[PDB]
Write a protein that binds this ligand. Structure first.
Ligand SMILES: Cn1ccc([C@H]2C[C@H](N(c3cc(F)c(NC(=O)c4ccnn(-c5ccc(F)cn5)c4=O)cc3F)c3nccn4nccc34)C2)n1
Length: 285
């Protein structure tokens, strides 16, 4: 039976199994709402979950599972993915709550629940219609999360609005659901990624925010993005986007990687722009 698979934890890489052992969740503290699916694919599924804290109070979570398991390699990759987040501790970066290892079945990767889902779908929703200032604030939040990750020498490689999520307090968490329109020029040419190519992707993400989730380069199938960028062309300034914020976008797309601002510089510059735009806003950024 597929629900009787038993994983030999001693087959896993020693550093991986040490990391998993520090984040174990006892099954008695977790209710997986197997009938409440957040998202499903061929290989995995994410469910609503309830964690019971040490007072018996409820923590809403999301619980990742593998579907059918046939080899230890699938399990190792699944756990390695979860453990990426283990040492992330920042308000603007998605964290790992832990890993639940029942006797049988898939290991379960437990994450804090993000009430408002991914940032791109959130800002595209016509009944959310976020204000200019709140969109700037979301960008500032992403910049703060990326400043933290860059300080840990973590290169994201797929920063985009679709990979950020928004929780109940409207805190943005940089994440990766697991991308040529977001890639730096040098990454398109060499397939090498750095923090400076994350800065390029952040520029595109800011553009996504200020267009309320318009697809960048919508005609991409009709031209070559490398040629476009080599000839100096860039995404055009969104309507209602403040001029200094568009200049920030342009700096992120400098053809010379070393000339792009650091994420520390971006936090300072966007915080200045946020502070002087006096408009309606709702969220704590
Ligand atoms: C076809 N389909 C569409 C959707 C899905 C499922 C649901 C979706 N889902 C989700 C998002 C993630 F983003 C993750 N993330 C990771 O598993 C992860 C692994 C390793 N490293 N990072 C990371 C973190 C920070 C960083 F800088 C770089 N990487 C990760 O984020 C897991 C999820 F289940 C959630 N949907 C709604 C609400 N919530 N609430 C918590 C999680 C989610 C996925 N399927």
């Amino acid at each position: 039976m597929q629900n009787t698979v038993h994983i030999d934890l001693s087959a896993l890489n020693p550093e991986l199994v040490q990391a998993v052992q520090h984040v174990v969740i006892g099954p008695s503290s977790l209710i997986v709402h197997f009938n409440e699916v957040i998202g499903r694919g061929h290989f995995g599924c994410v469910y609503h979950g309830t964690l019971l804290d040490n007072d018996g109070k409820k923590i809403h979570c999301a619980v990742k599972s593998l579907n059918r398991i046939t080899d230890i390699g699938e399990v190792s990759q699944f756990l390695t993915e979860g453990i990426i987040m283990k040492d992330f501790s920042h308000p603007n970066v998605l964290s790992l709550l832990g890993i639940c290892l029942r006797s049988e079945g898939s290991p379960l990767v437990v994450l804090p629940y993000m009430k408002h889902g991914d940032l791109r779908n959130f800002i595209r929703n016509e009944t959310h219609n976020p204000t200019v200032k709140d969109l700037i604030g979301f960008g500032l939040q992403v910049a703060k999360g990326m400043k933290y990750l860059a300080s840990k020498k973590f290169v994201h490689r797929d920063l985009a609005a679709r990979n950020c999520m928004l929780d109940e307090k409207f805190t943005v968490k940089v994440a990766d659901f697991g991308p040529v329109k977001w890639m730096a020029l040098e990454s398109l040419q060499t397939q090498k990624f750095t923090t400076k190519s994350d800065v390029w992707s952040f520029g595109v993400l800011l553009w996504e925010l200020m267009t309320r989730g318009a697809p960048p380069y919508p005609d991409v199938n009709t031209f070559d993005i490398t040629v476009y960028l080599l000839q100096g062309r860039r995404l055009l300034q969104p309507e209602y986007c403040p001029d200094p914020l568009y200049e920030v976008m342009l700096k992120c797309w400098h053809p010379k990687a070393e000339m792009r601002p650091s994420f520390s510089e971006l936090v300072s510059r966007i915080s200045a722009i946020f502070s002087t735009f006096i408009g309606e806003h709702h969220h704590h950024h």
